[PDB]
Amino acid sequence: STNQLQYLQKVVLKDLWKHSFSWPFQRPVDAVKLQLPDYYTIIKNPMDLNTIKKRLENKYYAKASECIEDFNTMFSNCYLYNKPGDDIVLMAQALEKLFMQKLSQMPQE
Amino acid sequence: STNQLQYLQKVVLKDLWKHSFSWPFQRPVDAVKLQLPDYYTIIKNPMDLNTIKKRLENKYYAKASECIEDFNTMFSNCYLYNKPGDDIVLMAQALEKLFMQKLSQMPQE
Ligand SMILES: CCS(=O)(=O)Nc1cccc(-c2cn(C)c(=O)c3ccccc23)c1
Ligand SMILES: CCS(=O)(=O)Nc1cccc(-c2cn(C)c(=O)c3ccccc23)c1
């Protein structure tokens, strides 16, 4: 599991962060700053790239599947809160496609 | 690759289909039957388990990544159209969890 978690930190997370569309995902959605009155009510488990980064650095995950769940939650949260056609959805879809590509190259340990 | 498309058909597709929550995804969303006046307007590429199945049967995909993209489109279509807390979303999330589990077991090279 440690080889895979290492790949998720040094390859997947790094490459997602470098992508030009990553900036809205680099910190938790700040619903007060953004004036989103229902966000915290209906998005039960907010997730973002910095929380995943900190969890990997602190060895919070026991298995790679736990970390992959958090990546997937960040994307579906975006899709669930927003609507088709929103530019934020376009950016999430670009990162999700890159995330999916890098997962395909994960060293099967 | 042929090994991976092969796994996607007899392993990933078969296990998603047998899941108790797969039935809303076994045919295209019929917006007239369900009286969803905006579905075909805002969901640009509808996708379902039967479309993927026939495409795999007909050798439509040239690479496993294109079939994986259709699976992801089916899930995000559902998240985009519906709202958090909807029961349809819970079943999509259960299938998408199973999808990522089978993906981690895909034979690499
Ligand atoms: C860096 C986190 S931030 O909250 O400090 N800045 C920031 C700036 C612009 C856009 C969003 C943003 C991100 N995501 C993922 C959303 O789903 C969303 C939904 C509605 C409105 C805005 C957003 C966040
Ligand atoms: C087998 C496809 S069906 O259209 O013949 N039957 C069917 C029956 C119940 C529910 C849905 C259904 C499925 N999905 C994926 C949705 O996103 C959705 C959104 C709003 C309302 C209903 C649905 C479809």
From Swiss-Prot, chains A, B:
JQ1 binds at N82. Ubiquitinated in a SPOP-dependent manner, leading to proteasomal degradation. It is found in: Nucleus. Interacts with mRNA splicing machinery proteins SRSF2, DDX5, HNRNPK and TARDBP. Interacts with the acetylated N-terminus of histone H1, H2, H3 and H4. Interacts with P-TEFb components CDK9 and CCNT1/cyclin-T1. Interacts with SMARCE1. Interacts with the acetylated N-terminus of histone H1.4, H2A, H2B, H3 and H4. Residues 2-106 form the Bromo domain. It is linked to Spermatogenic failure 21: An infertility disorder caused by spermatogenesis defects and characterized by acephalic spermatozoa in the semen of affected individuals. SPGF21 inheritance is autosomal recessive. It comes from the Eukaryota. The record marks N82, D87 as: Histone H4K5ac binding. Testis-specific. A 3-fold higher expression is seen in adult testis than in embryo testis. Expression seems to be correlated with histone H4 hyperacetylation during the haploid phase of spermatogenesis (spermiogenesis). No expression, or very low expression is seen in patients' testes with abnormal spermatogenesis. Expressed in cancers such as non-small cell lung cancer and squamous cell carcinomas of the head and neck as well as of esophagus, but not in melanoma or in cancers of the colon, breast, kidney and bladder. BRDT is a promising target for male contraception. Inhibition by thienodiazepine inhibitor (+)-JQ1 that binds Asn-82, prevents recognition of acetylated histone H4, causing a complete and reversible contraceptive effect in male mice. It comes from Homo sapiens. Bromo domains mediate interaction with histones that have acetylated lysine residues at specific positions. Bromo domain 1 mediates binding with histone H4 acetylated at 'Lys-5' and 'Lys-8' (H4K5ac and H4K8ac, respectively). The bromo domains also recognize and bind a subset of butyrylated histones: able to bind histone H4 butyrylated at 'Lys-8' (H4K8ac), while it is not able to bind H4 butyrylated at 'Lys-5' (H4K5ac). This is Bromodomain testis-specific protein. Testis-specific chromatin protein that specifically binds histone H4 acetylated at 'Lys-5' and 'Lys-8' (H4K5ac and H4K8ac, respectively) and plays a key role in spermatogenesis. Required in late pachytene spermatocytes: plays a role in meiotic and post-meiotic cells by binding to acetylated histones at the promoter of specific meiotic and post-meiotic genes, facilitating their activation at the appropriate time. In the post-meiotic phase of spermatogenesis, binds to hyperacetylated histones and participates in their general removal from DNA. Belongs to the BET family.
